[PDB]
Amino acid sequence: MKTVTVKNLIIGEGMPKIIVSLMGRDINSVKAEALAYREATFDILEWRVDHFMDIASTQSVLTAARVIRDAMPDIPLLFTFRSAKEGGEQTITTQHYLTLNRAAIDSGLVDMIDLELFTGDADVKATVDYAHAHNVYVVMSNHDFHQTPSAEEMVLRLRKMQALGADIPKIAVMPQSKHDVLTLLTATLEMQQHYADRPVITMSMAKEGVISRLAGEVFGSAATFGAVKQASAPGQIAVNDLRSVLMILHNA
Amino acid sequence: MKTVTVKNLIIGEGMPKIIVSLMGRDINSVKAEALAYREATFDILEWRVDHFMDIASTQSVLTAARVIRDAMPDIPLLFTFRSAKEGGEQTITTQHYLTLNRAAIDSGLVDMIDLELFTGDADVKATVDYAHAHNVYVVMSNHDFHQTPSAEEMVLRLRKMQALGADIPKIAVMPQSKHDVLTLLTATLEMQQHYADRPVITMSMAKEGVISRLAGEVFGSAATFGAVKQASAPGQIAVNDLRSVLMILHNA
Ligand SMILES: *C[C@@]1(O)C[C@@H](C(=O)O)C[C@@H](O)[C@@H]1O
Numbered sequence: 133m134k135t136v137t138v139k140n141l142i143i144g145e146g147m148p149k150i151i152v153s154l155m156g157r158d159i160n161s162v163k164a165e166a167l168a169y170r171e172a173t174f175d176i177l178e179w180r181v182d183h184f185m186d187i188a189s190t191q192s193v194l195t196a197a198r199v200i201r202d203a204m205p206d207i208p209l210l211f212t213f214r215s216a217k218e219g220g221e222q223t224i225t226t227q228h229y230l231t232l233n234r235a236a237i238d239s240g241l242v243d244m245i246d247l248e249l250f251t252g253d254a255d256v257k258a259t260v261d262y263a264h265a266h267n268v269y270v271v272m273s274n275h276d277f278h279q280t281p282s283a284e285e286m287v288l289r290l291r292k293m294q295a296l297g298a299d300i301p302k303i304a305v306m307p308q309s310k311h312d313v314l315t316l317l318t319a320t321l322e323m324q325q326h327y328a329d330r331p332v333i334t335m336s337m338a339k340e341g342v343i344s345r346l347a348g349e350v351f352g353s354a355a356t357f358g359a360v361k362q363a364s365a366p367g368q369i370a371v372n373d374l375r376s377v378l379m380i381l382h383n384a
Numbered sequence: 385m386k387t388v389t390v391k392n393l394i395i396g397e398g399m400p401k402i403i404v405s406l407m408g409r410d411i412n413s414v415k416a417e418a419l420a421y422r423e424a425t426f427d428i429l430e431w432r433v434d435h436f437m438d439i440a441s442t443q444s445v446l447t448a449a450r451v452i453r454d455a456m457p458d459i460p461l462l463f464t465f466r467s468a469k470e471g472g473e474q475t476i477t478t479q480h481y482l483t484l485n486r487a488a489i490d491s492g493l494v495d496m497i498d499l500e501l502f503t504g505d506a507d508v509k510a511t512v513d514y515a516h517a518h519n520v521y522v523v524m525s526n527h528d529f530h531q532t533p534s535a536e537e538m539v540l541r542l543r544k545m546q547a548l549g550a551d552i553p554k555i556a557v558m559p560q561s562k563h564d565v566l567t568l569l570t571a572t573l574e575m576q577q578h579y580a581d582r583p584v585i586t587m588s589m590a591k592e593g594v595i596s597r598l599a600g601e602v603f604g605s606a607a608t609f610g611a612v613k614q615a616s617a618p619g620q621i622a623v624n625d626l627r628s629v630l631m632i633l634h635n636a
């Protein structure tokens with residue numbers, strides 16, 4: 133296991149790390165969220181930049197990054213543009229997505245970026261290598277908001293992310309049944325049993341899948357998302373309740 | 385689903401019910417435990433009669449039952465002699481085991497008894513029918529402290545308990561791996577999906593299996609055991625922490 137350390141936070145051992153998401157639509161809302169979020173307890177801050185309305189503006193996005201860092205200078209910060217294709221709030225061209233992520237990398241303001249695997253192998257690999265050349269880690273991701281692939285499919289997808297240089301492969305899937313929740317847990321455990329070279333983040337979404345957000349220590353999900361006031365995906369629970377369950381499981 | 389109601393407690397719907405086990409070696413220790421336990425919060429009291437040293441005396445056992453009922457006149461009370469064969473503290477003859485359970489039934493002091501399936505079909509059936517003739521419910525049980533059977537085996541075992549007249553089939557198994565924990569959860573869900581006629585109680589023991597004690601609402605375990613001060617089987621967590629997790633899962 134190649135753990136990922138950002139400052140003194142170690143991702144891939146111990147209790148799953150708690151991530152929360154900023155969702156503001158402009159500089160002022162992002163600032164206000166960051167100032168509120170610093171009075172909550174969590175491990176990693178995600179900026180969900182697909183909520184940001186002025187996405188085309190290099191000045192706007194960098195100003196917003198700076199206000200986040202003014203508020204929380206030290207916190208591990210993950211920059212995520214979630215495409216609408218994968219459950220996010222808007223769509224941009226592939227070239228603008230690559231440009232955006234490269235700008236985040238160049239800023240020095242972010243510790244990690246999210247790259248969606250299905251953007252395309254060559255573009256993802258190039259961007260991973262650029263991130264790594266500038267001391268930024270990559271959460272490589274995939275999301276299915278409609279259904280749960282087979283465990284075999286999910287495992288091969290996470291392995292491909294490793295092969296492309298992901299520091300932390302991540303997959304989120306939508307259950308249609310309770311059985312699908314077990315499928316996601318099975319895929320997670322398969323990574324732990326057979327392919328434990330990188331920390332992986334997994335989740336089954338929605339209320340049916342919520343156990344997958346709690347049982348990461350058991351089956352091998354290295355991080356889990358909670359809601360400060362509003363969820364950034366279906367199935368997230370209040371961040372303090374999440375923390376309470378994680379602590380109980382760790383110390384049991 | 386044929387739920388089991390004792391007073392206003394419904395087993396087999398909603399949040400899994402919390403059971404705690406009273407363990408005392410003699411009449412005075414049983415009394416002291418009962419008086420301490422009534423200051424804890426839980427749904428069902430189990431008396432682990434196999435901890436009682438003067439087991440040969442049916443009258444001593446009945447005196448102890450009466451002290452428990454003096455202390456907690458209303459609580460749902462489950463009378464359980466767990467054989468050493470199935471992880472308990474001592475062994476008695478089959479005839480004395482049946483005699484003890486029939487005395488518990490006749491006393492009117494208990495709401496439920498535990499009968500171990502592998503005592504033998506004919507003896508179990510006769511005792512179930514006796515319990516039912518005197519308005520006592522049966523938790524029919526099986527325990528493997530060494531290993532986890534296949535999901536197919538566990539499902540057929542729980543179904544056999546239903547066929548013998550169990551009100552609540554119960555199985556506890558020991559994981560040797562994380563995979564075995566998933567097997568137990570799979571068998572639990574199979575009952576919910578395919579064989580949902582009776583509430584079932586399931587658990588994977590030890591620290592590895594603790595998620596199975598927490599996720600009963602999602603996969604279909606009707607009750608779960610917590611520890612007031614000392615665990616009555618490996619893997620139980622403190623009863624207040626158990627309750628906290630159950631509430632979070634129910635309200636998520
Ligand atoms: C990784 C991610 O897509 C997971 C979501 C979730 O299911 O909790 C939250 C998103 O904000 C995040 O980018």
Ligand SMILES: *C[C@@]1(O)C[C@@H](C(=O)O)C[C@@H](O)[C@@H]1O
Nearest residue numbers: 405464466556587609616617
């Ligand atoms: C039912 C039973 O065997 C379950 C044990 C457990 O694994 O929690 C506790 C015992 O006290 C109980 O009789």
